[PDB]
Amino acid sequence: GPCSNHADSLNNLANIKREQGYIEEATRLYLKALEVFPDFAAAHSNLASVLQQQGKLKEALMHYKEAIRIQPTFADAYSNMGNTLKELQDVSGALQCYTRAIQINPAFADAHSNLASIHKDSGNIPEAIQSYRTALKLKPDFPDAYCNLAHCLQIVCDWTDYDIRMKKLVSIVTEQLEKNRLPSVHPHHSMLYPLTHDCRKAIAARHANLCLEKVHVLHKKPYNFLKKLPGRLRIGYLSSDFGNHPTSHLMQSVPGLHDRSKVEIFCYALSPDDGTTFRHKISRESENFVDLSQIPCNGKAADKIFNDGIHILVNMNGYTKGARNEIFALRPAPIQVMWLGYPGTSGASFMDYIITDSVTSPLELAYQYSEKLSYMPHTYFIGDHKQMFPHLKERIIVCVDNVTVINATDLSPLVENTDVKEIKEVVNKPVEITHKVAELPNTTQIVSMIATGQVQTSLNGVVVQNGLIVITTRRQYMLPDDAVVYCNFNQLYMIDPQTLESWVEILKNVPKSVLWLLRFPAVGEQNIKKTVSDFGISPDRVIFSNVAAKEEHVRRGQLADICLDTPLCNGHTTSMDVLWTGTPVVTLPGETLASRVAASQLATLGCPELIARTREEYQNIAIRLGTKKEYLKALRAKVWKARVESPLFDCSQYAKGLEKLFLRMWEKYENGELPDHISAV
Ligand SMILES: CC(=O)N[C@@H]1[C@@H](O)[C@H](O)[C@@H](CO)S[C@@H]1OP(=O)(O)OP(=O)(O)OC[C@H]1O[C@@H](n2ccc(=O)[nH]c2=O)[C@H](O)[C@@H]1O
């Protein structure tokens, strides 16, 4: 009998200890309750969710099942089990638990919201939006549901009630911070919403504390460090993105370009081999390659790092998918650094330095960051473009440089069998520009090939491949030949109403102008048309193309006249892609790091004239460029020149800069010095 009443005392006592934040005590008391009365549903469930908090996901799962066995109609256990299964990468099982909770109780708001998260994670946004809507009809005061729904509406550019939604988001966060709860907005989404910098940093810090808490359970002693060095710094780059991922498209040449007499490089991969060349290249080029995806336990993973005797541990993930920040919370290296992958602060006590530059992160804005700033000599950004897209080093015009374009790794066959020549043109300053022009006055078979959807054609015995030796033409993407094409190739979530208003503003003032965007995702296309229409411009003047493979994408950009950056959150990589083809990008920097990346890139490129200071200047710079043919020609030439002359795409300069920064970090450590802001130059 009760007995079951004794089990009640302990369960509630464990509950009390859990409210106060004594997680170990609670666990022990829930265990004691189950030793006393094993068939106790509520206690299995409570123990499971405490076990889930501590990162013991496998054990939690065992006790949720015991709860559900004893009480089959325990909808709440099904729901939390679904979350544990989610965290364990088992999207399939999570889906069934949430389904089951809804079958038990169709009015269970959380289960609808949890389900919606699955849909959102899998890129199924319309379905996620229904489920979040459902959750909010059943429970209107549901911060988690509301903030995730808000994020889905960003992804799809649904801006209905935008201004009140943004304020409601800000209310919920500030409220949550004051009540000392973990907020409903993810630190990585932070940069989209009008939160104060202090707010964004607090969200970040709370995620960092989560990492410390999860890790406190291991009861490890702090690592003890080597204090003096006599030759080589051991640097460890830790990332889940070594493979086919934008991060490797930026940095893959860097490990192999490091001066091996100064530093020994270790690349720690957090994800499995995906068999791609990018993973192979980083594997070969890097002096040391370790795969930590084979070491699931964060405790052991930290140990391996400590055992490799690493001085500087570099976080390339921050709060992004695949991160294992618990490793950094264990402090397996005396100095720990954020670099490249996450455009924001960690807010973590266990991160010392962030790698940036003076444009991206001016000292005036240092309070944004928990980390001490460390300045690269020029921009903190890089790209492997010089190595990945050598065929895009220059273009060959066929017959204006952006209507029909040929690119090749080897131009021999074409130059040997057609009239290709390097004309000069003078443009009013007074500048001389060189073009390579292939003239064959037979547009027919080139247009005919595109018109019929042909894979290939042959100009005078030479095989030319349809870009959809390669040919790219405005027809391929439905762009008018005489149009002035403004482009942006970012995920649509980066666009807000103020951005779009400015773009319609420039389109209204530029005679034959068109806006080129991407179905990223497809379902956003409609919303953008509707709003454009509402702003007083024909929807037909905004042309959308499909998300393309990396090569086609960078190659397409050659057809744009001018690229327009998104001031809400700049296009970090795509803007590199576009610059590589010498297409100017006009930007307006804000205050967050993610707002200022393009400015940093352009500053390094030596083109500050493309960096606006107000919305008015942004629009005016873009209007002048679509309106003054000669000025546009001169600036595209300057951008083209700068792309090979400047450090922006120079991967070896970049390695040197990292080295100086790492040396400086060590010097401070070798002396008794606390981290403080440093610079390379
Ligand atoms: C705001 C933010 O979080 N930024 C992060 C940065 O701060 C980090 O520095 C980046 C590397 O760590 S990741 C991330 O950078 P982002 O620019 O947001 O890249 P994102 O993940 O949207 O995809 C663009 C890719 O799709 C390719 N792309 C694009 C269009 C197309 O048609 N085809 C195509 O292959 C493009 O060539 C690109 O390769």
Author numbering: 350 to 579, 582 to 750, 758 to 786, 789 to 828, 847 to 1059
Task: Give excerpts from the publication.
The enzyme that catalyses the addition of a single GlcNAc onto serine/threonine residues on intracellular proteins is O-GlcNAc transferase (OGT). OGT is highly conserved in metazoa, consisting of a C-terminal glycosyltransferase domain and N-terminal tetratricopeptide repeats (TPRs). In Drosophila, ogt is known as super sex combs (sxc), mutants of which do not develop beyond the pharate adult stage. sxc belongs to the Polycomb group (PcG) genes that play key roles in developmental regulation, stem-cell maintenance and genomic imprinting. Sequence similarity between hOGT and DmOGT is high, with 90% and approximately 80% sequence identity in the TPR region and the catalytic domain, respectively.
To determine how differences in sequence influence the overall structure of DmOGT and to provide a template for structure-guided mutagenesis, an N-terminally truncated construct starting at amino acid 353 in TPR 10 (Δ1–352) carrying a mutation (K872M) of a key catalytic lysine was expressed in Escherichia coli and crystallized in complex with the inhibitor/substrate analogue UDP-5S-GlcNAc. The structure was solved by molecular replacement and refined against 2.7 Å synchrotron diffraction data, yielding clear electron density for UDP-5S-GlcNAc. Crystals belonged to space group P32 and contained 3 molecules per asymmetric unit. As a result, the TPRs are in close association with the glycosyltransferase domain and the catalytic site is aligned with the channel along the main axis of the TPR superhelix. The catalytic site residues (H537, H596, Y871, K872, K928, H932, R935, H951, D955) that are found to interact with UDP-GlcNAc and the acceptor peptides in hOGT are conserved and similarly positioned in DmOGT, suggesting a similar catalytic mechanism involving the same UDP-GlcNAc and acceptor peptide binding modes. The intervening domain, a 100-amino acid insertion between the two Rossmann-like folds of the catalytic domain, is the site of lowest sequence conservation and highest degree of flexibility in the structures of both hOGT and DmOGT.
